[PDB]
Structures are given as structure tokens and as C-alpha cells.
Amino acid sequence: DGIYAAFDTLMSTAGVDSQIAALAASEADAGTLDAALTQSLQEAQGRWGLGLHHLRHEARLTDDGDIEILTDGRPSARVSEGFGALAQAYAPMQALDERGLSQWAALGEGYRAPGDLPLAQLKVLIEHARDFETDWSAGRGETFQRVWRKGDTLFVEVARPASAEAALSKAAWKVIASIKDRAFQRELMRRSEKDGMLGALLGNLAQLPEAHFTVQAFVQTLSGAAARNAEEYRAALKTAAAALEEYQGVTTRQLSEVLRH
Amino acid sequence: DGIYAAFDTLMSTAGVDSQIAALAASEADAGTLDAALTQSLQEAQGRWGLGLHHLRHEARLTDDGDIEILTDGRPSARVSEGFGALAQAYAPMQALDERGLSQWAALGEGYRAPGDLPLAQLKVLIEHARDFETDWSAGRGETFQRVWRKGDTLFVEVARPASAEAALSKAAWKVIASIKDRAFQRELMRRSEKDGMLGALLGARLAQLPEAHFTVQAFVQTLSGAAARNAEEYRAALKTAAAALEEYQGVTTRQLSEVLRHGL
User: Fold this and answer.
1) Rounded to the nearest 5°, which phi and psi values hold at A113?
2) What is d(CA A33, CA A19) in angstroms, rounded to the nearest whole number?
3) What is the recorded post-translational modification (chain B)?
4) B15-48: buried (b, 16+ CB within 10 Å) or exposed (e) per residue?
5) Are residues A173 and B189, on separate chains, in Cβ contact within 8 Å?
6) Residue in A closest to B141 by C-alpha
7) Residue of B178, B185, B247, B249 to mutate, testing the A interface (most A Cβ within 10 Å of its Cβ)
8) DSSP label at B262?
């Protein structure tokens, strides 16, 4: 239904198939739906790239038929408010450097190992340290990555910073190149010289979550004895990168089919 | 295809239709050609944004059928050495700040008035001073601008510095769009997501490319006689030259494009 379908819509900009409207239609119970909405919000958060791993993200159902999104137990926003408001709630919590990567430690304030360590030193932290966290390191294909352990869990992030407007602007690259009417094409090209590619194309998205959230990162997790295993980290690092290029590819494509429709 | 077409190709890079190949073939008179090379060469220098207004530019025919490019009467390059050769002959002579603007005065060493002068004060200079020169200021449209007078001629320069790389990039986009075979278009568009754009378009086939070394970065409007001492003639001069610079940028981008479609 309305709120459920909208939440769903938001999760999709992070490649999360939360299926919530169907769960609600299944006559699922309040706590079940809450668990499901919260679980999906956490996945999305790890792919949105906001750099907020240190906050706890919950989402709950309201008696007035809303969904209330929360971060560290404080009410941040309600789905019924629109996604741009969800954006504007997150913003002052964030801290991007000029590379658009999060300046926060996932573990909260403290020491961070450098991102460029030798596998031998990294292998020792994995095996024999409790909690640890490294900084960003430049990887294959303009991507960035960092590793950190919290409790029984190892986290691998692989990121490729690209704003929502960036994501839209690469979608306008493909929509213009695809156009079968060379008159409208050349006209949009001149108007693209003068207002960028997206503005030219626009001449309602504000309401679409694609305007405020896009896929920017992928987090891969290990648990138990895997989270103390150096072969398991390197598999997981490769996994997360493939995943990242996948979901960024899907979302570029689905966002193109939107920019036309 | 001959040294005249070589010179004609080099002049197209500033959007100067020299018509040298057609003159050389016409029934015109002896010596009219050297004059034409120099006339066409000086105009080209106004648009290249090299910052060499203080030097004198000449082009002549040599004894062995070549075209010699001169600076202050000294042999700087030969057209037959290609255009890159001309680029590095100019290089030791240049002096660009961080933005792409010449640090040389157009009038040689001497006092330069501020570039951010008030219009009432720039006017006095335009109505009553003899020779003068301002520094670069910014203008409208992410442009820059300065103005000098040498003699009876006012010189209004508007500039939008660009690397010949980005200009080649902008011409690649225009071409990969006009592409007819939608399959190869999507192939190029995907490589362009990976290997860059002008990268992936060159990859289907440049230092020989004239536009690889020279680009329209600026334009100099000129006033003479009575207009040259007229402050409203000056403010209009500035709008003309920004419009010019957009035009010749557009002409030279459409040219470089039609060049990139050959060899696909």
C-alpha cells in the first residue's frame, strides 16, 4: 500500500528488494514488518554510501500508518515526508571529504590503521586483534576500500563515490546517445552545453528517490571463524567489488529507463 | 597535399579561412601570397590564446617551397615540420599563469593598470591617455578580459582558456551521438564509461591532428579612430568579442568533429 510501496521504492535505489508491500499484504504482524523494514534500511545504508556505519539505523511502523526512520534511537524522518526530507535529515550527520568518501570511522572515534598495509600486517590484525579499523585505500578502477572488525563480524567496503546528480547525469549520457530524432538530439546537445546534460533533458524527479539516493558502495561481511581468516577477507574483498560494479550498473540502467518514461 | 593546404589546415584551427590554396592558384599578383600568410597568421594568433601580442608575427615562402613562420624576424618553424613542431617553437616564448592566461603585457614592460578598475576610471583612460594596458580581470560567462591601446587601435581581449585535450573531448561527445550504427554507438558509449571518451573514440583508429596543439581560447576585438576613444564602444566591444569567441569555438569544435568521423 502507499507508505509500504514508497518504502520499497526507496530501497530499490540501493538494489535492495525489500518486498515489504507484499509482506504487509501477506497480513504479516507488526513486529515482523518492523524487523523487515529495519533489515532493509540497514542494507540500503551500507550501499547508499552516506558514511554512517557508526549510527544504529532502525525503521518502524506508526499508528497513523507511517514509517518512521531512526538513527541512534532518535526520530530522523517519516516516509510520508518525501525522500528529499530523508536526504536533508541525513546531511548534517555526514562528513564527506573532497573525494566524497566518509571521514568518519565506522567504529567511532579512535585510531585507524592506514589503508595501504602489507597483507602480512593485515593478516595479523585479522587473526589476533579484537576490534580494528583501517582508512581508505585506492583500489582497482578508481574504487576505494576499507576493512574494520566490530565484535564477531568483519566488514569489507568497496566504494565508488558518485553523487545522485552524477548518477542522473550518466543516465542522461545514455538517453541522449540513444535518441532516434537527430533534430531533438542536436537541440538537447546545445541546451546541454548551456545547462548540463540532465537540465537539458528535463527541459517530478524531485519526488523520485533516484534524485537523492544512489548506489555508491558495497559492504561484504564475514562472521565467526571467517572474520578471523585472511583468505576469507580477500575473497570477500573481490566479492564486494564485483557486487559494487553490478548494482551500480543495474541502477544506471533502471534510472535510464526512468529518464525516458 | 601541398604546403599551402598545410598552412590552410593550420589556420582552420583558429577558424581562419585563409584561402591560401585558392589564392596560390588564382590569377592574383606576385607577392600577394606572403602578405596573405602573414595576414592570416596574425589573426590566428589573436584566437589561439598563446599570449604573444608583444612579438611580431610573419609567414613567408622560402627558397625550397616551404612556408617559414617568423617571430620578431627570426625563423621559428617550418610548416612542413607539422603543427606540433610549431607548438614547441612557441612554448619557450610563453608564460601562462594557473588559469591559462598570458602573464606578458601586450605592450611590453611598463605599468599595467588594475584589471578591476571602476568603469568611470577606465573611461578616462579610454578618452584621454595615450598607450595603456589593464591586467586580466574576470568577465561574464566564466570569461576573462583585458584591454590595451597601441597607437590608434584599441584592443579588447576576451578569453576562455582550455586545454586542446578538453576541446578534443567535447568534439568526441558531439560525434559519439551523431553515430548512425546504434550497436557501435553503445559499444563506444560503454568503452567511454571505462577507458574515457576521446580515448575510446581514438581507439577505433592525435599528434598529426592540427587541433591537438592549437585551439581557440580567446578573441581580440579591435577599435580604430574615434570609436577607440569611446567608453561605450568599449563595453560593446566586450560583448562582440565574447560572442565571437563562442562562435569560433563552435566552428572549430564542429570541424574537429568532422575530422574525427574520418577513420572510424
Assistant:
1) -60, 160
2) 10
3) Phosphorylated by RqkA in vitro. Phosphorylated primarily at Thr-62, and to a little extent at Ser-102 and Thr-134.
4) bbebebbebbeeeeeeeebeebbbebbebbbbbb
5) yes
6) A194
7) B178
8) T
Contact B177 A174 (CB under 8 A): no
Q: What single-letter amino acid sits at B11?
A: M
Distance between CA atoms of residues A237 and A126, nearest Å: 14
Q: Which of residues 76-95 of B touch A (CB under 8 A)?
A: none
User: Can you tell me the distance from the alpha carbon of A155 to that of A137, in angstroms, rounded to the nearest whole number?
Assistant: 15
Question: How many angstroms separate the CA atoms of B244 and B186, rounded?
Answer: 35
And the C-alpha cell for A142?
578508481
- Integer Cα distance of B16 and B186 in angstroms: 35
Give dist(CA A231, CA A254) in Å, integer.
Answer: 35
Asked whether B36 and B29 are in contact (CB, 8 A), the reply is no
CA B53 to chain centre: 12
Write the DSSP symbol of residue B180.
S
Distance CA A194, CA A214 (A): 25
For B214, the enclosing helix (H) or strand (E) is none
**Burial track B93-109 (b if 16+ CB lie within 10 A, e otherwise):** eeeeeeebbbebbbbee
Cell numbers representing residue B141 in the block: 560567462
Return d(Cα A85, Cα A107) in angstroms, integer. Answer: 27
The technique is: X-ray
The distance of A109 to chain B (nearest Cα, Å) reads 37
Name the A residues in 158-177 with CB < 8 Å from any B CB. 170, 173-174, 176-177
